């Protein structure tokens, strides 16, 4: 065994393939440098009234559409721990993007995770599926990344094994995103109002987005832990057609 090093030239060739998946909002995309980035984990957290589920469902459709920088579109894998995935929600978003309902639904693979162990086992099947249809899948959604870990390890003594299992899953997730060139989008809960997961989730995620309610029906996305400046914030809207721009 020789895991070795690769030159920065070889790494640059790998990074030339990096793409962004539009969120459906131009302002939100500007904030992210094009959208949900591949070879990286993007985490979105906030209250339940905010658009974490709307962004998850919107990405199920926008990831199938050809986009900027020659992004050709691709299939999606959705891992659901909350029992919130609703295919009927994708039909309204597909109508907004003028794309067939059955075709959108056929390009999304779905799995319910009932335990943290099951969630980790699902990542073994995800890697194998990506390996089968090479370059076909472009997005892996995990909604939500950590709720099952809080559930399975609800004791103070069981926190050591919780942290170990959580770190093992997140390091595998980073490896999947980088080896298979896919964008990984995960949602998270909060507990001040701070996201759960501590340093483990903060480290694994390359981009962390805080979602909050704005004026009336508008929403605000901000890069977490970044300074209080306008360039680190973006305004977006939530409609029956998913994440979009303000009127």
């Amino acid at each position: 065994i020789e895991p070795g090093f690769l030159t920065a030239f070889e790494y640059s060739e790998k990074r030339k393939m990096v793409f962004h998946i539009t969120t459906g909002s131009q302002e939100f995309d500007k904030l992210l440098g094009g959208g949900i980035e591949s070879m990286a984990i993007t985490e979105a957290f906030g209250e339940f009234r905010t658009g974490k589920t709307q962004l998850s469902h919107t990405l199920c459709v926008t990831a199938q559409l050809p986009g900027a920088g020659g992004y050709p579109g691709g299939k999606i894998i959705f891992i659901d721990t909350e029992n919130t995935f609703r295919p009927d929600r994708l039909r309204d978003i597909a109508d907004r993007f003028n794309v067939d309902h059955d075709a959108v639904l056929d390009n999304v693979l779905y799995a319910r995770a009932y335990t943290s162990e099951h969630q980790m086992e699902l990542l073994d099947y995800v890697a194998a599926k990506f390996h089968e249809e090479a370059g076909i899948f472009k997005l892996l959604i995990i909604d939500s990344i950590m709720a099952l870990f809080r559930v399975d390890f609800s004791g103070r003594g069981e926190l050591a094994e919780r942290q170990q299992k959580l770190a093992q899953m997140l390091s595998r997730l980073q490896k999947i995103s980088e080896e298979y060139n896919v964008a990984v989008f995960v949602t998270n809960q909060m507990t001040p109002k701070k996201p759960i997961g501590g340093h483990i989730l903060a480290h694994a995620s390359t981009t962390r987005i805080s979602l909050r309610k704005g004026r009336g029906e508008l929403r605000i996305a901000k890069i977490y832990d970044s300074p209080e400046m306008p360039e680190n914030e973006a305004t977006f809207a939530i409609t029956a057609g998913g994440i979009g721009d303000a009127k």
Partner: peptide, 13 residues
Amino acid sequence: PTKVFVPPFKTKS
């Protein structure tokens, strides 16, 4: 050759 992705423009059959 390789299998390319076909966006969901056309209705499935």
